[PDB]
Ligand binder design. Structure first.
Ligand code: HEM
Ligand code: NA
Ligand code: NA
Ligand code: NA
Lengths: 380, 5
Protein backbone atom coordinates (compact mmCIF):
# COMPACT_ATOMS: atom_id res chain seq x y z
CA UNK A 1 0.00 0.00 0.00
CA UNK A 2 1.79 3.10 -1.34
CA UNK A 3 -0.45 5.99 -0.19
CA UNK A 4 0.79 8.37 -2.93
CA UNK A 5 0.69 5.93 -5.85
CA UNK A 6 -1.48 7.33 -8.67
CA UNK A 7 -3.82 4.32 -8.64
CA UNK A 8 -4.32 4.64 -4.88
CA UNK A 9 -4.90 8.40 -5.09
CA UNK A 10 -7.47 7.81 -7.85
CA UNK A 11 -9.62 5.82 -5.41
CA UNK A 12 -8.10 4.74 -2.07
CA UNK A 13 -11.17 3.06 -0.54
CA UNK A 14 -10.67 -0.40 -2.14
CA UNK A 15 -7.13 -0.33 -0.73
CA UNK A 16 -8.45 0.65 2.71
CA UNK A 17 -10.89 -2.26 2.49
CA UNK A 18 -8.16 -4.76 1.57
CA UNK A 19 -6.19 -3.52 4.58
CA UNK A 20 -9.19 -3.75 6.92
CA UNK A 21 -10.10 -7.26 5.73
CA UNK A 22 -6.61 -8.63 6.45
CA UNK A 23 -6.03 -6.86 9.79
CA UNK A 24 -7.72 -3.90 11.44
CA UNK A 25 -4.36 -2.86 12.96
CA UNK A 26 -1.50 -3.41 10.47
CA UNK A 27 2.16 -2.72 11.21
CA UNK A 28 3.69 -0.62 8.40
CA UNK A 29 7.41 -1.18 8.89
CA UNK A 30 8.69 1.45 6.45
CA UNK A 31 6.45 4.21 7.81
CA UNK A 32 7.16 2.88 11.34
CA UNK A 33 3.51 3.21 12.31
CA UNK A 34 0.40 1.17 12.99
CA UNK A 35 -2.24 1.60 10.27
CA UNK A 36 -5.72 1.39 11.82
CA UNK A 37 -8.73 0.86 9.55
CA UNK A 38 -11.31 -0.70 11.88
CA UNK A 39 -14.10 1.48 13.24
CA UNK A 40 -13.90 0.10 16.78
CA UNK A 41 -10.13 0.55 16.88
CA UNK A 42 -10.17 4.09 15.48
CA UNK A 43 -12.98 5.07 17.86
CA UNK A 44 -11.04 3.57 20.78
CA UNK A 45 -7.80 5.42 20.03
CA UNK A 46 -9.38 8.79 19.27
CA UNK A 47 -11.19 8.88 22.62
CA UNK A 48 -8.35 7.64 24.84
CA UNK A 49 -6.06 10.59 25.57
CA UNK A 50 -4.61 8.83 28.62
CA UNK A 51 -2.84 6.12 26.59
CA UNK A 52 -2.68 7.85 23.17
CA UNK A 53 -1.70 11.48 22.74
CA UNK A 54 -1.19 14.27 20.22
CA UNK A 55 1.63 16.00 22.15
CA UNK A 56 4.86 14.22 21.26
CA UNK A 57 6.49 15.77 24.34
CA UNK A 58 4.67 13.02 26.27
CA UNK A 59 7.07 10.49 24.73
CA UNK A 60 10.12 12.70 25.34
CA UNK A 61 10.32 14.36 21.91
CA UNK A 62 11.59 17.94 22.01
CA UNK A 63 8.93 20.48 20.97
CA UNK A 64 9.71 24.21 21.28
CA UNK A 65 7.14 26.32 23.10
CA UNK A 66 6.74 28.47 19.98
CA UNK A 67 5.23 25.59 17.97
CA UNK A 68 2.58 24.41 20.46
CA UNK A 69 -1.01 24.49 19.25
CA UNK A 70 -4.47 23.23 20.17
CA UNK A 71 -4.11 20.23 17.85
CA UNK A 72 -0.77 19.14 19.36
CA UNK A 73 -1.56 19.70 23.06
CA UNK A 74 -3.06 17.18 25.48
CA UNK A 75 -4.63 17.70 28.92
CA UNK A 76 -4.17 19.69 30.99
CA UNK A 77 -2.64 22.20 28.56
CA UNK A 78 -5.22 21.41 25.87
CA UNK A 79 -8.21 22.51 27.94
CA UNK A 80 -7.24 26.17 28.28
CA UNK A 81 -6.79 26.89 24.57
CA UNK A 82 -9.66 24.56 23.64
CA UNK A 83 -12.10 26.34 25.95
CA UNK A 84 -10.83 29.69 24.67
CA UNK A 85 -11.58 28.73 21.06
CA UNK A 86 -14.97 27.23 21.94
CA UNK A 87 -15.95 30.33 23.90
CA UNK A 88 -15.09 32.54 20.92
CA UNK A 89 -17.08 30.24 18.63
CA UNK A 90 -20.11 30.27 20.92
CA UNK A 91 -20.15 34.08 20.97
CA UNK A 92 -20.89 34.23 17.23
CA UNK A 93 -24.63 34.68 16.50
CA UNK A 94 -25.68 31.73 14.36
CA UNK A 95 -28.38 33.71 12.55
CA UNK A 96 -25.68 35.94 11.07
CA UNK A 97 -23.39 32.99 10.33
CA UNK A 98 -26.13 31.13 8.46
CA UNK A 99 -27.07 34.26 6.51
CA UNK A 100 -23.44 34.79 5.48
CA UNK A 101 -22.90 31.15 4.52
CA UNK A 102 -26.15 30.98 2.54
CA UNK A 103 -25.43 34.20 0.63
CA UNK A 104 -21.86 33.16 -0.21
CA UNK A 105 -23.01 29.81 -1.57
CA UNK A 106 -25.85 31.38 -3.56
CA UNK A 107 -23.61 34.07 -5.06
CA UNK A 108 -21.00 31.62 -6.35
CA UNK A 109 -23.65 29.27 -7.75
CA UNK A 110 -25.31 32.17 -9.57
CA UNK A 111 -22.01 33.04 -11.26
CA UNK A 112 -22.00 29.53 -12.76
CA UNK A 113 -25.47 29.79 -14.31
CA UNK A 114 -25.22 30.68 -17.98
CA UNK A 115 -21.82 29.08 -18.52
CA UNK A 116 -22.00 27.16 -21.83
CA UNK A 117 -18.59 25.47 -21.58
CA UNK A 118 -16.81 23.25 -19.10
CA UNK A 119 -16.39 24.71 -15.61
CA UNK A 120 -14.15 23.37 -12.84
CA UNK A 121 -16.15 23.26 -9.61
CA UNK A 122 -12.98 23.06 -7.49
CA UNK A 123 -11.50 26.43 -8.45
CA UNK A 124 -14.86 28.04 -9.30
CA UNK A 125 -16.95 26.97 -6.29
CA UNK A 126 -15.44 24.78 -3.58
CA UNK A 127 -12.31 26.85 -2.91
CA UNK A 128 -13.76 30.39 -3.23
CA UNK A 129 -16.83 29.48 -1.15
CA UNK A 130 -14.63 27.97 1.55
CA UNK A 131 -12.31 30.99 1.62
CA UNK A 132 -15.09 33.56 1.94
CA UNK A 133 -16.90 31.36 4.46
CA UNK A 134 -14.00 31.00 6.89
CA UNK A 135 -12.98 34.66 6.63
CA UNK A 136 -16.58 35.80 7.14
CA UNK A 137 -16.66 33.63 10.27
CA UNK A 138 -13.29 35.02 11.41
CA UNK A 139 -14.38 38.58 10.66
CA UNK A 140 -11.41 39.45 8.45
CA UNK A 141 -11.05 40.51 4.79
CA UNK A 142 -10.47 37.54 2.45
CA UNK A 143 -6.92 37.29 1.08
CA UNK A 144 -6.34 36.67 -2.61
CA UNK A 145 -7.89 33.29 -3.32
CA UNK A 146 -5.34 31.97 -5.80
CA UNK A 147 -2.39 33.01 -3.65
CA UNK A 148 -3.92 31.74 -0.42
CA UNK A 149 -4.65 28.36 -2.01
CA UNK A 150 -0.98 28.07 -3.04
CA UNK A 151 0.35 28.65 0.48
CA UNK A 152 -2.41 26.52 1.99
CA UNK A 153 -1.67 23.67 -0.43
CA UNK A 154 1.95 23.51 0.75
CA UNK A 155 0.73 22.88 4.30
CA UNK A 156 -1.68 20.19 3.08
CA UNK A 157 1.09 18.42 1.17
CA UNK A 158 3.39 18.66 4.21
CA UNK A 159 0.97 16.39 6.09
CA UNK A 160 2.47 13.59 3.97
CA UNK A 161 6.09 14.48 4.79
CA UNK A 162 6.45 11.10 6.50
CA UNK A 163 6.01 9.54 3.06
CA UNK A 164 7.90 12.16 1.03
CA UNK A 165 10.23 14.13 3.34
CA UNK A 166 10.85 16.85 0.74
CA UNK A 167 7.30 18.06 1.45
CA UNK A 168 8.23 19.17 4.98
CA UNK A 169 10.18 22.35 4.19
CA UNK A 170 7.58 24.06 1.94
CA UNK A 171 5.03 23.35 4.66
CA UNK A 172 7.11 25.05 7.35
CA UNK A 173 7.57 28.16 5.20
CA UNK A 174 3.84 28.21 4.49
CA UNK A 175 3.00 27.83 8.18
CA UNK A 176 5.17 30.87 8.92
CA UNK A 177 3.47 32.86 6.15
CA UNK A 178 0.01 32.06 7.52
CA UNK A 179 1.23 32.88 11.04
CA UNK A 180 2.15 36.42 9.99
CA UNK A 181 -1.30 36.71 8.41
CA UNK A 182 -2.93 35.67 11.69
CA UNK A 183 -0.65 38.04 13.60
CA UNK A 184 -1.82 40.96 11.45
CA UNK A 185 -5.46 39.98 12.03
CA UNK A 186 -4.95 39.74 15.80
CA UNK A 187 -3.52 43.27 15.75
CA UNK A 188 -6.13 44.87 13.47
CA UNK A 189 -9.28 42.74 13.40
CA UNK A 190 -12.66 44.24 14.27
CA UNK A 191 -14.43 43.18 17.45
CA UNK A 192 -16.98 41.43 15.23
CA UNK A 193 -16.05 37.86 14.36
CA UNK A 194 -14.10 34.96 15.79
CA UNK A 195 -10.70 36.67 15.83
CA UNK A 196 -12.05 39.54 17.91
CA UNK A 197 -13.72 37.10 20.30
CA UNK A 198 -10.59 34.94 20.68
CA UNK A 199 -8.58 38.07 21.39
CA UNK A 200 -11.04 39.08 24.09
CA UNK A 201 -11.12 35.58 25.60
CA UNK A 202 -7.33 35.25 25.64
CA UNK A 203 -6.92 38.31 27.80
CA UNK A 204 -8.83 36.62 30.61
CA UNK A 205 -7.66 33.02 30.41
CA UNK A 206 -3.87 33.16 30.03
CA UNK A 207 -2.68 31.19 27.03
CA UNK A 208 0.81 31.52 25.54
CA UNK A 209 0.39 34.00 22.73
CA UNK A 210 2.24 31.54 20.51
CA UNK A 211 -0.39 28.88 21.19
CA UNK A 212 -3.18 31.33 20.38
CA UNK A 213 -1.57 32.45 17.12
CA UNK A 214 -0.77 28.86 16.12
CA UNK A 215 -4.29 27.79 17.10
CA UNK A 216 -5.94 30.60 15.13
CA UNK A 217 -3.83 29.55 12.14
CA UNK A 218 -5.25 26.05 12.59
CA UNK A 219 -8.80 27.44 12.63
CA UNK A 220 -8.12 29.35 9.41
CA UNK A 221 -6.35 26.53 7.59
CA UNK A 222 -8.55 23.74 8.94
CA UNK A 223 -11.63 25.81 8.14
CA UNK A 224 -10.52 26.59 4.59
CA UNK A 225 -9.04 23.25 3.54
CA UNK A 226 -11.49 20.94 5.30
CA UNK A 227 -14.54 22.80 3.96
CA UNK A 228 -12.99 23.22 0.50
CA UNK A 229 -12.18 19.51 0.23
CA UNK A 230 -15.51 18.36 1.68
CA UNK A 231 -17.44 20.51 -0.79
CA UNK A 232 -15.38 19.16 -3.68
CA UNK A 233 -15.95 15.54 -2.74
CA UNK A 234 -19.65 16.09 -2.09
CA UNK A 235 -20.06 17.87 -5.42
CA UNK A 236 -18.22 15.02 -7.15
CA UNK A 237 -20.80 12.59 -5.75
CA UNK A 238 -23.76 14.82 -6.57
CA UNK A 239 -22.67 15.34 -10.19
CA UNK A 240 -22.53 11.57 -10.72
CA UNK A 241 -25.65 10.88 -8.60
CA UNK A 242 -28.02 13.85 -8.98
CA UNK A 243 -30.84 11.72 -7.52
CA UNK A 244 -29.35 12.52 -4.10
CA UNK A 245 -30.73 16.06 -4.44
CA UNK A 246 -34.15 14.82 -5.62
CA UNK A 247 -35.17 13.75 -2.11
CA UNK A 248 -37.81 15.25 0.19
CA UNK A 249 -35.59 18.26 1.00
CA UNK A 250 -36.97 18.78 4.51
CA UNK A 251 -34.82 19.83 7.46
CA UNK A 252 -34.84 16.25 8.79
CA UNK A 253 -34.27 14.57 5.42
CA UNK A 254 -31.28 16.82 4.71
CA UNK A 255 -29.95 16.07 8.20
CA UNK A 256 -29.67 12.40 7.24
CA UNK A 257 -28.32 13.20 3.77
CA UNK A 258 -25.68 15.58 5.11
CA UNK A 259 -24.61 13.01 7.71
CA UNK A 260 -24.08 10.41 4.98
CA UNK A 261 -22.21 12.84 2.72
CA UNK A 262 -19.84 13.71 5.57
CA UNK A 263 -19.38 10.04 6.46
CA UNK A 264 -18.55 9.15 2.86
CA UNK A 265 -16.73 12.24 1.57
CA UNK A 266 -15.16 13.70 4.72
CA UNK A 267 -11.68 14.65 3.51
CA UNK A 268 -9.60 13.60 6.54
CA UNK A 269 -8.13 10.24 5.54
CA UNK A 270 -5.53 9.91 8.32
CA UNK A 271 -5.40 11.14 11.93
CA UNK A 272 -2.27 10.35 13.92
CA UNK A 273 -1.50 9.59 17.57
CA UNK A 274 1.47 8.45 19.66
CA UNK A 275 1.13 5.69 22.25
CA UNK A 276 1.94 7.04 25.71
CA UNK A 277 1.24 3.78 27.61
CA UNK A 278 1.12 0.20 26.32
CA UNK A 279 -2.42 -0.65 25.26
CA UNK A 280 -4.07 -3.40 23.18
CA UNK A 281 -5.62 -2.16 19.93
CA UNK A 282 -7.40 -4.67 17.72
CA UNK A 283 -5.35 -7.85 17.73
CA UNK A 284 -2.14 -5.97 18.53
CA UNK A 285 -0.25 -4.79 21.60
CA UNK A 286 0.66 -1.16 20.85
CA UNK A 287 3.70 -0.01 22.81
CA UNK A 288 4.70 3.32 24.34
CA UNK A 289 6.48 5.36 21.68
CA UNK A 290 4.66 3.74 18.75
CA UNK A 291 2.91 5.93 16.19
CA UNK A 292 -0.62 5.07 15.08
CA UNK A 293 -2.23 6.44 11.92
CA UNK A 294 -6.02 6.22 12.26
CA UNK A 295 -7.58 5.84 8.79
CA UNK A 296 -10.85 7.41 9.87
CA UNK A 297 -12.22 7.60 6.32
CA UNK A 298 -11.63 3.84 6.16
CA UNK A 299 -13.36 3.38 9.53
CA UNK A 300 -16.38 5.20 8.09
CA UNK A 301 -16.61 2.35 5.54
CA UNK A 302 -16.37 -0.52 8.06
CA UNK A 303 -19.28 -2.83 7.07
CA UNK A 304 -19.75 -4.10 10.63
CA UNK A 305 -20.98 -0.60 11.53
CA UNK A 306 -22.16 0.74 8.13
CA UNK A 307 -23.72 -2.08 6.08
CA UNK A 308 -23.48 -1.34 2.35
CA UNK A 309 -20.73 1.05 3.48
CA UNK A 310 -20.10 2.76 0.13
CA UNK A 311 -23.74 3.80 -0.30
CA UNK A 312 -25.82 6.68 1.00
CA UNK A 313 -28.46 5.15 3.29
CA UNK A 314 -30.83 7.69 4.83
CA UNK A 315 -31.98 5.50 7.75
CA UNK A 316 -28.70 4.98 9.61
CA UNK A 317 -28.28 5.85 13.28
CA UNK A 318 -26.90 9.36 13.76
CA UNK A 319 -23.71 10.06 15.67
CA UNK A 320 -21.62 7.14 14.38
CA UNK A 321 -19.22 8.45 11.74
CA UNK A 322 -15.72 9.57 12.70
CA UNK A 323 -15.18 12.26 10.05
CA UNK A 324 -15.02 14.98 12.74
CA UNK A 325 -13.00 12.80 15.11
CA UNK A 326 -14.11 11.93 18.62
CA UNK A 327 -13.28 12.96 22.16
CA UNK A 328 -11.18 15.85 23.41
CA UNK A 329 -9.84 16.87 19.99
CA UNK A 330 -13.15 16.45 18.13
CA UNK A 331 -13.61 19.06 15.42
CA UNK A 332 -14.22 22.54 16.80
CA UNK A 333 -16.10 23.43 13.62
CA UNK A 334 -18.27 20.33 13.23
CA UNK A 335 -21.42 22.39 13.72
CA UNK A 336 -20.25 25.09 11.32
CA UNK A 337 -19.38 22.53 8.64
CA UNK A 338 -22.73 20.73 8.83
CA UNK A 339 -24.60 24.05 8.74
CA UNK A 340 -22.48 25.11 5.76
CA UNK A 341 -23.10 21.94 3.75
CA UNK A 342 -26.82 22.22 4.53
CA UNK A 343 -26.88 25.72 3.02
CA UNK A 344 -24.94 24.49 -0.01
CA UNK A 345 -27.53 21.77 -0.62
CA UNK A 346 -30.31 24.34 -0.26
CA UNK A 347 -28.62 26.74 -2.67
CA UNK A 348 -28.23 23.95 -5.22
CA UNK A 349 -31.93 23.06 -5.03
CA UNK A 350 -33.03 26.69 -5.32
CA UNK A 351 -30.57 27.33 -8.15
CA UNK A 352 -32.27 24.87 -10.48
CA UNK A 353 -28.96 24.07 -12.17
CA UNK A 354 -28.10 20.63 -13.57
CA UNK A 355 -24.41 19.73 -13.25
CA UNK A 356 -23.31 16.94 -15.62
CA UNK A 357 -19.77 15.49 -15.78
CA UNK A 358 -17.58 16.97 -18.52
CA UNK A 359 -14.63 14.70 -17.77
CA UNK A 360 -13.29 12.66 -14.85
CA UNK A 361 -12.84 13.79 -11.30
CA UNK A 362 -9.08 14.31 -10.92
CA UNK A 363 -7.47 13.91 -7.51
CA UNK A 364 -4.48 15.74 -6.07
CA UNK A 365 -1.54 13.67 -4.75
CA UNK A 366 -2.42 14.29 -1.10
CA UNK A 367 -2.96 11.23 1.10
CA UNK A 368 -3.77 12.63 4.55
CA UNK A 369 -6.32 15.21 3.34
CA UNK A 370 -8.12 14.01 0.22
CA UNK A 371 -8.83 16.66 -2.38
CA UNK A 372 -9.85 17.06 -5.99
CA UNK A 373 -7.46 18.76 -8.38
CA UNK A 374 -10.28 19.37 -10.87
CA UNK A 375 -14.00 18.61 -11.19
CA UNK A 376 -15.07 19.44 -14.76
CA UNK A 377 -18.80 19.80 -15.42
CA UNK A 378 -21.22 21.34 -17.88
CA UNK A 379 -23.94 23.63 -16.50
CA UNK A 380 -27.43 23.48 -18.02
CA UNK B 1 0.74 10.99 7.90
CA UNK B 2 -0.50 13.68 10.28
CA UNK B 3 -3.64 15.83 10.03
CA UNK B 4 -1.83 18.93 11.27
CA UNK B 5 -2.50 22.44 9.99
C1 HEM C 1 -15.06 26.04 9.40
C2 HEM C 1 -14.96 24.71 9.48
C3 HEM C 1 -13.94 24.03 10.43
C4 HEM C 1 -13.22 24.57 11.43
C5 HEM C 1 -13.23 26.02 11.94
C6 HEM C 1 -12.39 23.52 12.00
C7 HEM C 1 -11.51 23.64 13.05
C8 HEM C 1 -10.92 22.59 13.73
C9 HEM C 1 -9.98 22.71 14.82
C10 HEM C 1 -9.46 24.03 15.41
C11 HEM C 1 -9.64 21.47 15.20
C12 HEM C 1 -8.67 21.08 16.34
C13 HEM C 1 -9.46 20.83 17.62
C14 HEM C 1 -8.57 20.29 18.70
O1 HEM C 1 -7.48 19.74 18.37
O2 HEM C 1 -8.95 20.39 19.90
C15 HEM C 1 -10.36 20.53 14.37
C16 HEM C 1 -10.29 19.16 14.46
C17 HEM C 1 -10.76 18.28 13.52
N1 HEM C 1 -11.42 18.60 12.36
FE1 HEM C 1 -12.09 20.45 11.87
N2 HEM C 1 -12.64 22.35 11.30
C18 HEM C 1 -13.58 22.64 10.33
C19 HEM C 1 -14.09 21.75 9.41
C20 HEM C 1 -13.86 20.40 9.38
C21 HEM C 1 -14.44 19.46 8.45
C22 HEM C 1 -15.43 19.86 7.33
C23 HEM C 1 -13.96 18.24 8.74
C24 HEM C 1 -14.28 16.89 8.06
C25 HEM C 1 -15.38 16.74 7.31
C26 HEM C 1 -13.07 18.37 9.88
C27 HEM C 1 -12.37 17.35 10.48
C28 HEM C 1 -11.71 17.43 11.69
C29 HEM C 1 -11.20 16.33 12.48
C30 HEM C 1 -11.29 14.83 12.14
C31 HEM C 1 -10.62 16.84 13.57
C32 HEM C 1 -9.96 16.03 14.71
C33 HEM C 1 -8.46 15.86 14.50
C34 HEM C 1 -7.90 15.14 15.71
O3 HEM C 1 -8.36 14.01 16.01
O4 HEM C 1 -6.99 15.71 16.36
N3 HEM C 1 -13.02 19.70 10.23
N4 HEM C 1 -11.14 21.25 13.49
NA1 NA D 1 -7.24 35.20 -6.90
NA1 NA E 1 7.75 1.99 20.50
NA1 NA F 1 -8.89 23.08 -10.56
Amino acid sequence: YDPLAPSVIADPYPFYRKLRETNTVHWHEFLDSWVVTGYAECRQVLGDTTNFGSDFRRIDVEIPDTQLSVQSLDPPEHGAIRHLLVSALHEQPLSTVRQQFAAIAAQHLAELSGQPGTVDLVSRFARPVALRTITAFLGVPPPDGAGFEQWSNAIVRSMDAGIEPARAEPGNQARAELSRLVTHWLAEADERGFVGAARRAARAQDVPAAVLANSLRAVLHAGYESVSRLLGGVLARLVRHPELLAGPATRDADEALVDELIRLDGPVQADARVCVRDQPVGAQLVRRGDVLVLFIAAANRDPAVFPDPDAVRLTRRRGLHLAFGRGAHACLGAGLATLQLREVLGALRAGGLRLAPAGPAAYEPTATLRGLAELPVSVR
Amino acid sequence: MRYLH
